[PDB]
Amino acid sequence: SGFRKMAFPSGKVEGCMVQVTCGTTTLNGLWLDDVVYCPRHVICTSEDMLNPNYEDLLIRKSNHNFLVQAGNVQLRVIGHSMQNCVLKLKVDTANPKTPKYKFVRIQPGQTFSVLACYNGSPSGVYQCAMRPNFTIKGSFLNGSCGSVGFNIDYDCVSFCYMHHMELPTGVHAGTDLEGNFYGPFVDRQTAQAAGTDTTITVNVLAWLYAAVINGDRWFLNRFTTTLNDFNLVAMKYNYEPLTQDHVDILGPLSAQTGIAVLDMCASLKELLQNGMNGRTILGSALLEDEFTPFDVVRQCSGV
Amino acid sequence: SGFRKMAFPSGKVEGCMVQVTCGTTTLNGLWLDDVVYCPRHVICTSEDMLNPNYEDLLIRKSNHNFLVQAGNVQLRVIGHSMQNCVLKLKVDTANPKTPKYKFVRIQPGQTFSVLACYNGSPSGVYQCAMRPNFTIKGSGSCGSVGFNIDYDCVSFCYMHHMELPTGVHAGTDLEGNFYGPFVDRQTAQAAGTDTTITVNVLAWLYAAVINGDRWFLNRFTTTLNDFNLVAMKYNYEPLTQDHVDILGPLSAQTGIAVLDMCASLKELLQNGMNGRTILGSALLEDEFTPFDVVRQC
Ligand SMILES: O=c1c(O)c(-c2cc(O)c(O)c(O)c2)oc2cc(O)ccc12
Ligand SMILES: O=c1c(O)c(-c2cc(O)c(O)c(O)c2)oc2cc(O)ccc12
């Protein structure tokens, strides 16, 4: 009963967080097996930030120029390598707390948990979505770079996000764990445009299904709609187009509530065109798009 | 920057969660030192739920009637005791993962993180407030615990026992005392009229200012009493001087008098937000304490 925006249990990731210092810059790194991963801008000074040449900057660094601390333990750096926008520090000790893990790149609209850390130490954990424009609206103070986002299958941690920077708009941008940025962003201190953001339609629909599961049925109409009529409305209201793939993954929720996806779309259409008139759904006067269909099913019997 | 409803890192609590089975009822337990804590209704059968006599029910149980499994291993129960509404199952093995910990009873309006578990295993973690009526709007789960973390010490403040017929959740501290007027019986039970946690809304408005959302601010002022008259009308907790005092550090960092923020909240209550949002929400948010805002900002 009830419905919460829940994050993954963070213990498997807490045991991987280390502190990485180079020059005067300190940030968070991810220690898995015998490799520590961190944003490459750890090698930049305040005078490099405008247009750094990372290859030239890295060439002036040696293994002993990187201090990696795991709790009260210094790790010995026995090698360094740059892969896209992340730095990989080879250390002489494998992490005894290495969970089973994968590196994954996620699609826009997918969700993950973020373990916000500061100089190697966890501060908190929260659940968020990769925006359609490849940014995230997180909580990252100065010193948070290197904090990672993740999902957990059962005992396996799929790392999907590493935080690099806050854009001038206040939203956050980062890479997968191979150093490839989500979206058009580069790790330089220049103004950079994020694309026009949209609402994740399939997530709103999943969350309306969650509302029905919890008794909030007031928004349900028996009006119906075609997929393409709905998408015309979605475009007007800056919602992501709804595809058959989205309809397919909403299947299990359609079955449980006995509500055809297109009937739920017609009810969402009414919400988009008429508003909520001061009523709420699952305690919100706004339409929530940070629950995937999987998240909703998962909360209804998880672990 | 940015502002999220963040939960505490849950690792120190994950290592304390075990599975407790008695009869045919299985639920979550908390394993600290050589004691496993769990709701006492684990000893009830489906025929006892309506009006159990827990002393009589426990008297018919022995140590071998409690199955405590920590991951892949059974723990040996070498004694049992009932303290108010929780069982303490003495075991022959101290939890090697016991964090530094305290048991704390919290006040209404204070916040904590919940590690929602099912039959001993974590499902997720979320941040919530103890409602003024002592219920919790949260999400096999009985025995999951709520907690705060100071630095390396876990203050356990909550254990989940039951869902009320309204769907809200109720539970105890770790000495087994219920928050609120509730009893661990399967009967209809009223929770009091809930109110909004005023001092938390004010803290969150400070967080909004810190993150750039200043649009609700005015130089219109108010007394503590003029404000509280408004607060009562909109089902808001009355604002005390203690509340004004703990909002001090936020007032000092932002340059906004507490009463100025109160007057700004007064206008929000009387006029609504008129379709505008604060920190991405169209409703006034009351699950951040002044401390929560300060530690996150
Ligand atoms: O937004 C940025 C940022 O937060 C940091 C950062 C993060 C940390 O955690 C640190 O410790 C630190 O020194 C710097 O570096 C950047 C470098 C760029 O080239 C562009 C943008 C950023
Ligand atoms: O709401 C209640 C509830 O959820 C459970 C419960 C929880 C679990 O996690 C279990 O595994 C389990 O068997 C039972 O027991 C109750 C017992 C009462 O006397 C009154 C209310 C509840």
UniProtKB/Swiss-Prot annotation, chain A:
It comes from the Viruses. Cleaves the C-terminus of replicase polyprotein at 11 sites. Recognizes substrates containing the core sequence [ILMVF]-Q-|-[SGACN]. Cleaves and inactivates human TRMT1, preventing tRNA guanine(26)-dimethylation of tRNAs. May cleave human NLRP1 in lung epithelial cells, thereby activating the NLRP1 inflammasome pathway. May cleave human GSDMD, triggering alternative GSDME-mediated epithelial cell death upon activation of the NLRP1 inflammasome, which may enhance the release interleukins 1B, 6, 16 and 18. Also able to bind an ADP-ribose-1''-phosphate (ADRP). Inhibited by pyridone-containing alpha-ketoamides compounds 13a and 13b. In turn, alpha-ketoamide 13b (tert-butyl (1-((S)-1-(((S)-4-(benzylamino)-3,4-dioxo-1-((S)-2-oxopyrrolidin-3-yl)butan-2-yl)amino)-3-cyclopropyl-1-oxopropan-2-yl)-2-oxo-1,2-dihydropyridin-3-yl)carbamate) inhibits SARS-CoV-2 replication in human lung cells. Inhibited ex vivo by michael acceptor inhibitor N3. Inhibited ex vivo by compound 11a and 11b. Residues 1-303 are cytoplasmic. Residues 1-303 form the Peptidase C30 domain. This is 3C-like proteinase nsp5. The active site is at H41, C145. It is found in: Host cytoplasm; Host Golgi apparatus; Host nucleus. 3CL-PRO exists as monomer and homodimer. Only the homodimer shows catalytic activity. Interacts with host FBXO22; this interaction promotes the proteasomal degradation of nsp5. Changing N142A: Does not affect ability to cleave and inactivate human TRMT1. There is a cross-link at K5, K90 (Glycyl lysine isopeptide (Lys-Gly) (interchain with G-Cter in ubiquitin)). It catalyses: TSAVLQ-|-SGFRK-NH2 and SGVTFQ-|-GKFKK the two peptides corresponding to the two self-cleavage sites of the SARS 3C-like proteinase are the two most reactive peptide substrates. The enzyme exhibits a strong preference for substrates containing Gln at P1 position and Leu at P2 position. It comes from Severe acute respiratory syndrome coronavirus 2 (2019-nCoV). Changing K90R: In strain: Beta/B.1.351.
From Swiss-Prot, chain B:
The active site is at H41, C142. It catalyses: TSAVLQ-|-SGFRK-NH2 and SGVTFQ-|-GKFKK the two peptides corresponding to the two self-cleavage sites of the SARS 3C-like proteinase are the two most reactive peptide substrates. The enzyme exhibits a strong preference for substrates containing Gln at P1 position and Leu at P2 position. Inhibited by pyridone-containing alpha-ketoamides compounds 13a and 13b. In turn, alpha-ketoamide 13b (tert-butyl (1-((S)-1-(((S)-4-(benzylamino)-3,4-dioxo-1-((S)-2-oxopyrrolidin-3-yl)butan-2-yl)amino)-3-cyclopropyl-1-oxopropan-2-yl)-2-oxo-1,2-dihydropyridin-3-yl)carbamate) inhibits SARS-CoV-2 replication in human lung cells. Inhibited ex vivo by michael acceptor inhibitor N3. Inhibited ex vivo by compound 11a and 11b. It is found in: Host cytoplasm; Host Golgi apparatus; Host nucleus. Residues 1-297 are cytoplasmic. Coiled coil: none annotated. There is a cross-link at K5, K90 (Glycyl lysine isopeptide (Lys-Gly) (interchain with G-Cter in ubiquitin)). Residues 1-297 form the Peptidase C30 domain. Changing C142A: Complete loss of 3C-like proteinase nsp5 cleavage. Cleaves the C-terminus of replicase polyprotein at 11 sites. Recognizes substrates containing the core sequence [ILMVF]-Q-|-[SGACN]. Cleaves and inactivates human TRMT1, preventing tRNA guanine(26)-dimethylation of tRNAs. May cleave human NLRP1 in lung epithelial cells, thereby activating the NLRP1 inflammasome pathway. May cleave human GSDMD, triggering alternative GSDME-mediated epithelial cell death upon activation of the NLRP1 inflammasome, which may enhance the release interleukins 1B, 6, 16 and 18. Also able to bind an ADP-ribose-1''-phosphate (ADRP). 3CL-PRO exists as monomer and homodimer. Only the homodimer shows catalytic activity. Interacts with host FBXO22; this interaction promotes the proteasomal degradation of nsp5. This is 3C-like proteinase nsp5. It comes from Severe acute respiratory syndrome coronavirus 2.
